[PDB]
């Protein structure tokens, strides 16, 4: 329900439904590819909801539970470059390039982050 409301460009009810999904599964089974999807979709909704702090928190949680994830590191680079945390942005972006050298957007993101850091 959260995913379909997100796809329907109606994020507010998607956010509440994914929050309900998280709170139902919060107490049990942190592993088993369920909490991972819940937290990832919730972080995506928050980043599309323009609220970044809790999105970064959930992305950090899933990165803790799974480090082998190029998409996660690209998302952290996105969120950190949205804010002015350039060091974390470039670190996670380099991690993503390490995870997958041939990333289309990540090259441009790295160029922009380096240019902004130098000009800062």
């Amino acid at each position: 329900m959260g995913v379909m409301y997100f796809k329907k460009n109606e994020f507010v009810k998607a956010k509440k439904y994914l929050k309900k999904a998280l709170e139902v599964v919060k107490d049990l089974d942190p592993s088993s590819r369920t909490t991972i999807s819940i937290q990832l979709n919730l972080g995506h909704t928050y980043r599309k909801l323009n609220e970044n702090e809790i999105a970064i928190k959930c992305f950090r949680c899933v990165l803790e539970k799974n480090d082998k994830n190029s998409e996660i590191h690209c998302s952290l680079g996105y969120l950190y470059l949205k804010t002015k945390k350039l060091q974390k942005a470039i670190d996670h972006l380099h991690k993503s390039l390490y995870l997958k050298p041939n990333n289309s957007s990540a090259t441009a993101l790295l160029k922009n982050a380096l240019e902004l850091n130098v000009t800062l």
């Binding site: 380096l114 240019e115 130098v118």
Partner: protein, 148 residues
């Protein structure tokens, strides 16, 4: 910082001067205490066209390391390009004091002396240059008949 320096060099050899400068500034920021990183970044800046900022960075480098032969070589080259031979003279003098056994220093010292106009200094330094090395004597010979 070694990765940053390598990226800057790789951008430099391909002609992307502004990108190479972009890497080199970060390389400096990682390790503020350096000399040849300073020199390479300043060379990138003068490739951009910012000669004054390149000179300021070069002066910061020479202040940080008073004994740096390559830095002094860069001050000499840049001052020769900018027609500041009055101070370039003492730069080459201190440089040839630092390195007495290299024919390149004698060559540039004699060339600067000839440009200034001291014929005796130019001929003496060029004679030392040919005595030290015959591999590059082709240019040294030309500097001979030009002065003579």
């Amino acid at each position: 910082y070694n990765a940053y320096y390598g990226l800057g060099t790789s951008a430099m050899k391909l002609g992307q001067y502004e990108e190479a400068l972009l890497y080199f500034e970060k390389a400096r920021s990682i390790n503020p205490v350096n000399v040849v990183l300073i020199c390479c970044c300043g060379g990138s800046l003068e490739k951009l066209g910012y000669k004054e900022k390149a000179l300021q960075y070069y002066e910061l480098a020479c202040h940080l390391q008073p004994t740096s032969s390559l830095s002094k070589y860069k001050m000499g080259q840049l001052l020769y390009s900018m027609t500041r031979y009055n101070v370039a003279l003492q730069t080459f003098e201190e440089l040839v004091k630092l390195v007495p056994d290299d024919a390149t220093a004698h060559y540039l010292l004699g060339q600067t002396y000839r440009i200034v106009g001291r014929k005796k200094d130019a001929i003496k330094e060029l004679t030392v240059a040919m005595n030290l090395d015959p591999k590059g004597n082709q240019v040294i010979i030309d500097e001979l008949q030009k002065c003579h």
